[model samples]
Target: MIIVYTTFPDWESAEKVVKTLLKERLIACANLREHRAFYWWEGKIEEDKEVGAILKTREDLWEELKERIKELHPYDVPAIIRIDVDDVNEDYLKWLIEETKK
Candidate 1:
């Protein structure tokens, strides 16, 4: 399984993006959370309330899925990251593969 992480300004934006990917079968599942983050921008430290989401899908879908997220994302520089999962349960991995199939 491949996992994607991203942060959004709010729940509404996160949900909008997540739902679209789910419907399009770009992601097999997603989990979203309320988040507080501190980061540097323009030589200053900034903190904000954000929404963080974890998305699960197959590795082959990475490129296209990432572009779709960019298209829907509002931020000029969205916090997008991809994780290569080393291991997963057999049943779960099987389910992800099945769900993400074209």
Candidate 2:
């Protein structure tokens, strides 16, 4: 499974969330990257550099991750979007399952 979230502009905050999720087996891996964002918030059309995290995890763990993100995220309306991963790499899948072993 794939999930997305808009994170604080700082990489440290992004990495903190990423590391926690991976360490706890909530996500197999995460990519935190710079992305340009344009949107309306609180009234104005705003644009800025934003860091976003793309998470990979088991589909069954999505609800748990979403709730956890909600609790940890600082945004008023956090962007925790879940997406179905279309194509997956076999070796990575194996590693993911191994790392997430209960």
Candidate 3:
């Protein structure tokens, strides 16, 4: 599985992107949360409330997933980070791949 991590400024924006990907089978599922983030922007450390989303899908769908998220994301430079996961449970991995199949 490939886990894609991203954050939106708010819940609405996160939902808009996540729900669309869910409906289109671009991602198997998402884990979303409301969190406080501290980051450097404009040469200063800033704290902001954001919605963090972890999207799960097959590795083969990376290009499509990355491109679609950018297209749908609200941020000028949206966080489209990915982590390769190979130690996932067999049944879960199977289901994930099945759900994300084009």
- The digit string of per-residue lDDT tens for model 3 on 17-95 reads 8999999999999999999999898999999999999999988899998999989989999889999996978999889
Candidate 2 residue runs with Cα over 4 Å from true position: none
> Considering only N, C-alpha and C atoms within 3 Å, which residue pairs clash in candidate 1?
none
* lDDT for 75 (candidate 3): 93
Q: Which ten residues in a row are the worst by lDDT in model 1?
A: 93-102
lDDT of 1 by residue, 1-101 (tens): 78999999988899999999999999999999988899997899999999999999999999999999999997879977999999999899999988884
Candidate 2: tens digits of C-alpha lDDT, residues 62-99:
78888988877756687888888787888888787777
Error of 2 at 80 (Å): 0.6
lDDT comparison, 2 vs 3, better candidate = 3
Query: Candidate 3: deviation at residue 63, Å?
Result: 0.7
Clashing pairs in 3: none
The number of clashing residue pairs in each candidate reads 0, 0, 0
TM-score of each: 0.94, 0.86, 0.93
Global lDDT of each candidate: 0.92, 0.77, 0.92
The collision pairs in model 2 are none
- Using TM-score as the measure, which candidate wins? 1
Error of 1 at 9 (Å): 0.0
